[PDB]
Amino acid sequence: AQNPNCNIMIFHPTKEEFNDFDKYIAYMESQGAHRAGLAKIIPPKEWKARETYDNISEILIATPLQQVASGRAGVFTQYHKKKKAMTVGEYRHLANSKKYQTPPHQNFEDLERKYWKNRIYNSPIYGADISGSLFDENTKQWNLGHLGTIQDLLEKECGVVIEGVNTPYLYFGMWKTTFAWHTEDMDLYSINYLHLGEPKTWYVVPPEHGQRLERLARELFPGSSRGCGAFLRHKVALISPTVLKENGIPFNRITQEAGEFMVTFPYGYHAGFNHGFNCAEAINFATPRWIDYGKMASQCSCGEARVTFSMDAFVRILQPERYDLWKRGQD
Numbered sequence: 001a002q003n004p005n006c007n008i009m010i011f012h013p014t015k016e017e018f019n020d021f022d023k024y025i026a027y028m029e030s031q032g033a034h035r036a037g038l039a040k041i042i043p044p045k046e047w048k049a050r051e052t053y054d055n056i057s058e059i060l061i062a063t064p065l066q067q068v069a070s071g072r073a074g075v076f077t078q079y080h081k082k083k084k085a086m087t088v089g090e091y092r093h094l095a096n097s098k099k100y101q102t103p104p105h106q107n108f109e110d111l112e113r114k115y116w117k118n119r120i121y122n123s124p125i126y127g128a129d130i131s132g133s134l135f136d137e138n139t140k141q142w143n144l145g146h147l148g149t150i151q152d153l154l155e156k157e158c159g160v161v162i163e164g165v166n167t168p169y170l171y172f173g174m175w176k177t178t179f180a181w182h183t184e185d186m187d188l189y190s191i192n193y194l195h196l197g198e199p200k201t202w203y204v205v206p207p208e209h210g211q212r213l214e215r216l217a218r219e220l221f222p223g224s225s226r227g228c229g230a231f232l233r234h235k236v237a238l239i240s241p242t243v244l245k246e247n248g249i250p251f252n253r254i255t256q257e258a259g260e261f262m263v264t265f266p267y268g269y270h271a272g273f274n275h276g277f278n279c280a281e282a283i284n285f286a287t288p289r290w291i292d293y294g295k296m297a298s299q300c301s302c303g304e305a306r307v308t309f310s311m312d313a314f315v316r317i318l319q320p321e322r323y324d325l326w327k328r329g330q331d
């Protein structure tokens with residue numbers, strides 16, 4: 001079995017290997033990359049996402065989210081308070097202000113220490129989940145707006161034609177902005193490209209050990225667990241590496257820098273934080289190997305998780321027994 005310790009793997013495809021996206025994902029899995037839940041892909045030196053980032057300041061962040069924490073430094077939840085709209089230029093200036101800017105630090109490990117010590121005492125503002133793309137239309141390789149759609153994959157594997165679309169999303173971050181522990185909708189893959197700015201640190205639990213993280217989360221967030229049998233779908237809970245180590249949960253960590261791709265694999269729980277002002281683009285995708293994970297994915301039916309239009313068909317076709325209850329949660 002390849003990669004039996006479930007380490008995060010890093011890949012350096014050549015320009016020739018960067019042509020065929022599906023083929024390269026299947027290659028990475030042949031080497032055991034999925035066992036970690038996360039892989040890094042460094043694009044060939046010839047590739048670029050677009051020519052420059054000099055003209056992005058007028059993108060609108062219609063609903064910036066202030067991420068307010070509750071709990072203790074290593075075990076907390078966050079809620080998202082909606083803020084007034086602002087442009088990317090306005091948000092960049094905010095991120096760089098004395099109130100929100102990255103503190104002085106020695107290296108990524110010192111910054112990670114400071115994040116876990118101090119996150120809860122601040123409420124950073126995240127421009128998350130903005131439909132759109134920063135890939136130039138002429139970028140033909142690993143252009144996250146030109147991937148094969150999940151609906152087309154389901155149709156190719158299973159023969160059923162379904163409604164829905166699959167488009168990318170932009171994330172504008174600042175110091176301390178945080179992504180809570182989660183797997184993707186329907187335990188899909190994700191791919192995330194860091195277009196510009198400061199790094200993003202990731203934590204990940206191997207898919208084969210995801211239920212260990214779930215059981216710890218039920219212990220640590222007991223009221224949330226009683227409220228919903230899949231409350232990590234709410235994407236609000238944080239658990240620090242120190243707490244994970246104290247409770248024996250297998251995990252790994254890695255820092256993504258500008259110009260790098262990360263792939264999350266089906267049922268790979270992940271969480272992380274931004275080091276400073278940055279912009280990422282991410283989208284979900286599927287492969288043949290995903291189908292079985294989609295069929296087994298948990299679902300939130302309490303009403304909190306509320307998701308996209310296109311998840312309907314995935315539930316309806318892959319999980320018909322759960323469909324009625326899940327749809328009630330959506331309505």
Ligand SMILES: O=C(O)CNC(=O)C(=O)O
Binds near residue numbers: 192
């Ligand atoms: O970058 C972020 O805030 C969160 N991204 C992801 O969870 C992802 O790409 O799957």
Ligand SMILES: [Mg+2]
Binds near residue numbers: 057058
């Ligand atoms: Mg602009």
Ligand code: NI
Binds near residue numbers: 190264
């Ligand atoms: Ni994710």
Ligand SMILES: [Zn+2]
Binds near residue numbers: 230233304
């Ligand atoms: Zn729920």
